[PDB]
């Protein structure tokens, strides 16, 4: 019996806490177990004997995951679809600095978070930021670009070309 | 020396301005 397991942060428990309940249904139309362990503050997945298609506890796998990273739930689920994929960018490691990490992870929302939303208009996908990570979720390309923007963003390289780029090319695709 | 950036945040944010 496949199974996977996933380390959430003490602020997100309450809100888990009161949506599992819907969790489990959403997840119990594909006859896929899940617990939520508050002891070792994490939540799992797995397959039983009654699951029809065990290849999509790789996408069970992928909700609890964006659910530990604060992505709404509503949202987040929409990942047990076959079409949507999702992508979890680590932006911790690429700064020794504290306080420079920040500044660079403010430029990648920007100012009332406006460039993000650009972002999010360009590569068709949502995108969430939140500590140390980056969660995205859309089709692959747009996925991708995001991945890009935001790994080259976070190595000094200014967003705006990327942006004016798609921009360009959303431009010819008319 | 991070003048740059600081003109590219203005320069962004005025060509977002200027599309929407």
């Given amino acids: ?174 | 020396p991070e003048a740059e950036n600081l003109q590219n945040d203005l320069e962004l944010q005025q060509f977002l301005r200027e599309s929407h």
Wanted: charged share 30%.
């Fill in chain 1, 1 to 174: 019996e496949s199974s996977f397991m996933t380390l959430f942060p003490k602020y997100r428990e309450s809100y888990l806490k009161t949506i599992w309940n819907d969790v489990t249904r959403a997840l119990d139309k594909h006859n896929i177990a899940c617990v939520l362990d508050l002891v070792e503050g994490s939540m799992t997945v797995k397959t039983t004997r009654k699951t029809y298609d065990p290849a999509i506890i790789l996408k069970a796998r992928d909700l609890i995951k964006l659910l530990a990273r604060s992505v709404p739930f509503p949202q987040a689920v929409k990942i047990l679809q076959d079409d949507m994929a999702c992508d979890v960018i680590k932006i911790g490691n690429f700064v020794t600095n504290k306080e420079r990490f920040v500044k660079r992870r403010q430029r990648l929302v920007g100012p009332n978070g406006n460039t993000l939303k650009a972002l999010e208009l360009l590569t068709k996908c949502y995108i969430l930021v939140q500590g140390n990570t980056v969660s995205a979720m859309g089709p692959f390309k747009g996925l991708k670009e995001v991945r890009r923007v935001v790994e080259d963003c976070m190595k000094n390289i200014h967003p705006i070309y990327h942006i004016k780029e798609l921009m360009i090319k959303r431009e010819l695709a008319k």
